[PDB]
Design a binder for this molecule. Structure first.
Ligand SMILES: CC(=O)CC(=O)SCCNC(=O)CCNC(=O)[C@H](O)C(C)(C)COP(=O)(O)OP(=O)(O)OC[C@H]1O[C@@H](n2cnc3c(N)ncnc32)[C@H](O)[C@@H]1OP(=O)(O)O
Ligand SMILES: CC(=O)CC(=O)SCCNC(=O)CCNC(=O)[C@H](O)C(C)(C)COP(=O)(O)OP(=O)(O)OC[C@H]1O[C@@H](n2cnc3c(N)ncnc32)[C@H](O)[C@@H]1OP(=O)(O)O
Ligand SMILES: CC(=O)CC(=O)SCCNC(=O)CCNC(=O)[C@H](O)C(C)(C)COP(=O)(O)OP(=O)(O)OC[C@H]1O[C@@H](n2cnc3c(N)ncnc32)[C@H](O)[C@@H]1OP(=O)(O)O
Ligand SMILES: CC(=O)CC(=O)SCCNC(=O)CCNC(=O)[C@H](O)C(C)(C)COP(=O)(O)OP(=O)(O)OC[C@H]1O[C@@H](n2cnc3c(N)ncnc32)[C@H](O)[C@@H]1OP(=O)(O)O
Ligand SMILES: CC(=O)CC(=O)SCCNC(=O)CCNC(=O)[C@H](O)C(C)(C)COP(=O)(O)OP(=O)(O)OC[C@H]1O[C@@H](n2cnc3c(N)ncnc32)[C@H](O)[C@@H]1OP(=O)(O)O
Ligand SMILES: CC(=O)CC(=O)SCCNC(=O)CCNC(=O)[C@H](O)C(C)(C)COP(=O)(O)OP(=O)(O)OC[C@H]1O[C@@H](n2cnc3c(N)ncnc32)[C@H](O)[C@@H]1OP(=O)(O)O
Ligand SMILES: [Mg+2]
Ligand SMILES: [Mg+2]
Lengths: 260, 260, 260, 260, 260, 260
């Protein structure tokens, strides 16, 4: 479509992957309201498409996303913030049932990092950097920069990053558990698309059920989480993809999932 | 013992360790109903012996446990799953009050990894591999594969493993936090038995209290968890082992615990 | 003031860091009642100082803190423990609103480790060692040794340490996520003071808000934690430091915060 | 608007209340997809008007709402429900910032009860009846009929109603804590509108803050709930309505709130 | 049967109700280990029986249950309690998938109340009395007396009953939320059996699903509870009883559930 | 001592009850800083006294407590409220380990009600009235007025009370679950003192353990709550009062508890 801040395209073999590239080189992919609206529109379009099984979110080679547009929230008041719910538009990735992979290249600072943390899988470039510089501007991370970061990298490093604003390299993020894989800067997006293809090659319903079961780990106790996992495992037996996969395992061949 | 799927024996000097080795090289230690029943029987036999203080669960050098038997759950309906409470036996391992050490060698896929994750300590071989290939057969984990895994390796790697089924290495499992030690393939079981001995040489009641206090970290908030830990610490003063150990420390001697 | 077990002073340029050094070489900084009382007094003094923005807690070069005074709890009964509410003085550190950095050198065993775990950021020396030897004396941790450690280094390593009492090196602590950075034994305290300076250079109210937001990650679910974080982010707009920092960023100048 | 399933109009003096009356006497106000869409549209319209401070949801004198249209979900399959998320649109009531009062007359069965339970205040007629007859049609509540009802009336009565579908009278609903006030059939709507006026006469920002604080009681522990309540109380001081009301009370005069 | 402490019978038309009556009038139905074992055996028998859809638990006309056997627990010690895990067998009632109705006649003190609180529905007689006199004998409840009671009657009444040991009448329990119906002493068991028949008349799988969804209210937050309820509602469509009932209603006829 | 705003005395036979009466009829017992400080001092004095087993908090015949002093918080700003941690002195009442009974007479509005809600048992007079008028001044409760009230009287009535500032009589408060007993205005304090005596006539350690178990119901899940209750029940066996009471019961005699 006519997107002036993002570029949404169907990549990957058989056009099974959705790539949304934030295109704002003049502001280091600053997450303005219009950019967030365009991103939500692209996510809705890719989610309602039966061919796209996975989505890949990426930015530029120099900066993935520098965070919220400080120029816009400069004159905002407490009353305005509480009335308009400024950052409610940002929590749309959390509702996307299809897996989303974040290809983080370059600066992932503040909201950007938070954005990367809202995705399911994060692939970081060799020169990628993660930071929470909100404290340097008299603000705190307000879109998941303390909850998800603390749960992922622990209390110590999360506190350090949030109170000092120091940056961590892709290697530190991978060692702490924030990112799962490190890839070259030039092949990051390609490996992300390959992973998205590997994901989409499976049944979409089972993929969404597994995503929900994994997300439940941060919302429920271990016992209730295990019970919900058991209920979802029981429910998977009602789909035809489970039977097809089990028959393709018993009988030596490949499975053909119909997404039902 | 007339066991056809497992081998249970007392090991370690003074016979204080219990070793249960899964013996089914023809199915890569597929966790069938009979195998799980034999495992539960061996656990209950070692959990009631006043000599065994710790248990060590291991498999073959080629595969620790391939998971549930697909050939058994192939022709299984949702009604059957719900009525029979399928996979209930698998949770019995979590009821064992004595520490259980998982010596994972080779393949630990699906229900196997969960099994290793249901133990307190996991020792992995240099060539050991963990994975959650449920998605490849049209199903999802159902015994804590998405709950315990996510709480140890983070959201990114857990999501990746659950949605793609890719295998992780022992070094990756240790760096993420799934396993604690990487032992040679030829000495894994020996070091696991030595750790079980070291654990069993302490007060059994205090060991169980510590295990419960550690497990409570995944079921309660930090404040209530710390309060329960403090209550257990107060309760430990009712046992004679605490006074014995403290008097041995103050007198610079060895403590002879009586398990009471 | 006149302290027998600790030394409290103001370090860092402009006298902005509060350094509390435990001084008890003959007992390896054993956390006795008097030592804890003096530590609480120093923490209260530094928290009520408008010039101190961060506190640095450290011990000796040989041992940071060996744990509670076993000599004092040897003849303690269950009734005495529950009537006196033992160890509650230790939780005062968790009530400090200002950030506290733990510079751990040498032995950090038992309560000492818990002490470091009660702080926000932990800096460990190259030769620092962490352990939980409570099980070796017939007791268990009672000040978060099984709750924070489990959440930090995972279930496997936490269980191993708690049930065996073995020690982990500073490198293992960093790889597991218990500590954030490793510094030479000669510059540990200096680097900790330098980090505390950077921390205190920001708005104190915003720093406290960020600390509360990060701490909320261990007391609430992801949804409620994120909602509380959003509410605190909205509230930050009521302070003048937020507007000052945002204007300095827009104007490309240094922000002169005033703690309001 | 040209709504065909509901009637939305401004009521109360100064047009401060919004009234949405479900109009479908041929199906006992069955909650069909079109009716839910019209209800959500009316809510969004009333939630964006700076004059409407409260909303009153009501139905007919014979039946408030008979629940979802069974004739529409008759042929729905498990995959269809999982993919389309049949009962997702119903949750919009939970996202309304302004308070909503439910005027229940006659039958409030199944969804109609859940809908009433999704509102903040419930006023029932002298002859109103509540029930959960899902069990009688081979299904269970799916919009909170087992969570809110159990928290409101308790485990015993909730279990009874859910497993038998027996109807409870407005008197038994007030005695159990589900209904707050019982009114005559011919005066229920007027008293509900008077209560909505009393609510809207206050500062809308503080009203929404108090609504959120009350809702937080069912989402977090008592300690974190009280901490969030204290944080919201601190934040209320940033508004002008707080100081205005406090000065009007200290001066013994009327307060003129301006919603800021 | 060969039982000596209880009487287990199949009552109700078509023998669809399971009646377990405590038959130890010489000790006011003291809950001894043998009585609990017989109760668990009868519960397992009635659960494995496909004809039984609901269970009714009752005692004598003078006393339902006086609680645990004070004579058996007199010489117990802390070490014995911790090693044998006293009162664990009592939790079997919480694992019964089929609904259980408690017909409380006469005294229900201590455990007898907790047992009654472990069931899904509680029918109390006009002369029934509930109390927690454990405090009068130097111990606190240990089978949910402080957890389930507080969640039903409120903090004030629960605290009063637990600390003073005072008794509450059946009317007080009905007005608080502990019991759902009050019946004459002569027809209590008959009305309980009628309710059990009405419950069993529905599909057993959906009844168990609804019971689980209701129990979920006391284990997770409102959001996760509603999500689990919605997932169970989706899963109910995989059964044939849902479609059967919906078609029977659409065709204006009675539904014939086959429990599948 | 010389208290200018309260009167603390030892009432009840054997001087086993601690009565604290708020004496400020000119401001309807408005809770100010000095009044709260004196209340905390009296509470600490009565808690440290080995003879007082229970405390009774009461006010005047016309008003129990009209809430916080609006005259002081009038000119308070957000920064002041946040830096000073306003109203934390009110939480000390929740830290009292001994039971506290609230005798409410006349007006119990806002903070006062919260104060009554902070106690364990609430005895209300025939003319007592409870309300949350914080909405009528432009603020919200800040001492648990929305959490405890919502957990006690339900959402439907708590929302109304918080958004309208309406007064509920002692009868409604008792029917909803906020108060446990209604007594004449002239005999309220006497019955409260009698209940305090009945409570103090038991083992103080067991009473404190029971209070802790009951309070745990609002901080943990049902399963973890039951496990903590079981742990406390096991710990009670370490005290001598348990054995004494059990022997007195088995021997049909009066128990002589030694508070140990
Ligand atoms: C609510 C939230 O959770 C998020 C937030 O509050 S924002 C917190 C995270 N983001 C930040 O703090 C802002 C980024 N801060 C910086 O210092 C940097 O720009 C950077 C480190 C990312 C890169 O630094 P750099 O390489 O020197 O490039 P730099 O010249 O500063 O930036 C290029 C342009 O992007 C703009 N820009 C950068 N970050 C921006 C942001 N967050 N918002 C708006 N504009 C931004 C710059 O102002 C500049 O624009 P101009 O043409 O008008 O000069
Ligand atoms: C949560 C739950 O409880 C549910 C689950 O876990 S679902 C199970 C998830 N786990 C798996 O799918 C892993 C099994 N998948 C595999 O792809 C492979 O068997 C493997 C990668 C483990 C081994 O690869 P391999 O070295 O080539 O050996 P392979 O020839 O496949 O297997 C040897 C035998 O074990 C059987 N086997 C292996 N895994 C099995 C399993 N999970 N169930 C049943 N049988 C299995 C094979 O069918 C084969 O049997 P046959 O002699 O009849 O041919
Ligand atoms: C959670 C809680 O609050 C409860 C707890 O923490 S329980 C305490 C857990 N801590 C421990 O068990 C201590 C660790 N065990 C040890 O054996 C050693 O003391 C150590 C490994 C720290 C040092 O080893 P070392 O280099 O050989 O020196 P060592 O000779 O043992 O100790 C030096 C002095 O400190 C004392 N000391 C060391 N740790 C102590 C402790 N936790 N309490 C009291 N005194 C201690 C020694 O007794 C000794 O004093 P003396 O002059 O009387 O001999
Ligand atoms: C899981 C969820 O959360 C979703 C749900 O809510 S499931 C729905 C649970 N609720 C119900 O089942 C209640 C509806 N069931 C009934 O038995 C009855 O209609 C009643 C008990 C409400 C009493 O009503 P009544 O006046 O005696 O009978 P009735 O003649 O059937 O009602 C009038 C009309 O509304 C229809 N109707 C009533 N309830 C309906 C419903 N939930 N859906 C669709 N149509 C309904 C009737 O079929 C009938 O329509 P026709 O003109 O085609 O005959
Ligand atoms: C697991 C839990 O949480 C529960 C627990 O731990 S402790 C159980 C707490 N429950 C109690 O304390 C109730 C028992 N206390 C009593 O005061 C009384 O027995 C009562 C009020 C129930 C009955 O009053 P009563 O009508 O006068 O009858 P009473 O003469 O006392 O009892 C009849 C016989 O039952 C026995 N009995 C009564 N309650 C008993 C109990 N809980 N356990 C064992 N035996 C009991 C009596 O000892 C008594 O004497 P004999 O058998 O030797 O002849
Ligand atoms: C921490 C919290 O959660 C609490 C809060 O945030 S805010 C406090 C919430 N509570 C209230 O607002 C109730 C107080 N408001 C009132 O309107 C009334 O006083 C009342 C409804 C209690 C009825 O009182 P009344 O019978 O008409 O007598 P009234 O003349 O108003 O009061 C007598 C005196 O007490 C004062 N007073 C009453 N309530 C007061 C309060 N909360 N604070 C300070 N002073 C108060 C009056 O101003 C008056 O003092 P003066 O001699 O200066 O006139
Ligand atoms: Mg880690
Ligand atoms: Mg009630």
């Amino acid at each position: 479509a006519n997107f002036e801040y993002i570029i949404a395209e169907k990549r990957g073999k058989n056009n099974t992957v959705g790539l949304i590239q934030l295109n704002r080189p003049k502001a280091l992919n600053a997450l303005c309201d219009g950019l967030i609206d365009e991103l939500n529109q692209a996510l809705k379009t890719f989610e309602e498409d039966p061919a796209v099984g996975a989505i890949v979110l990426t930015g530029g080679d120099k900066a993935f996303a520098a965070g919220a547009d400080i120029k816009e929230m400069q004159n905002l008041s407490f009353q305005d913030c509480y009335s308009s719910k400024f950052l409610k538009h940002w929590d749309h990735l959390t509702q996307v049932k299809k897996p989303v992979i974040a290809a983080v290249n370059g600066y992932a600072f503040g909201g950007g990092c938070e954005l990367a943390m809202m995705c399911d899988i994060i692939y970081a470039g060799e020169k990628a950097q993660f930071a929470q510089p909100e404290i340097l501007i008299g603000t705190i991370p307000g879109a998941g920069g303390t909850q998800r970061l603390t749960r992922a990298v622990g209390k110590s490093l999360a506190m350090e990053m949030v109170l000092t604003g120091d940056r961590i390299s892709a290697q530190d993020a991978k060692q702490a558990g924030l990112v799962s894989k490190i890839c070259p800067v030039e092949t990051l997006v390609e490996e992300a698309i390959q992973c998205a293809e590997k994901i989409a090659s499976n049944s979409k319903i089972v993929v969404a059920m597994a995503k929900e079961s994994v997300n439940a780990a941060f919302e429920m106790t271990l016992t209730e989480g295990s019970k919900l996992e058991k209920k979802l495992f029981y429910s998977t037996f009602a789909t035809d993809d489970r039977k097809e996969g089990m028959t393709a395992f018993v009988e030596k061949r490949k499975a053909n999932f119909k997404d039902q």
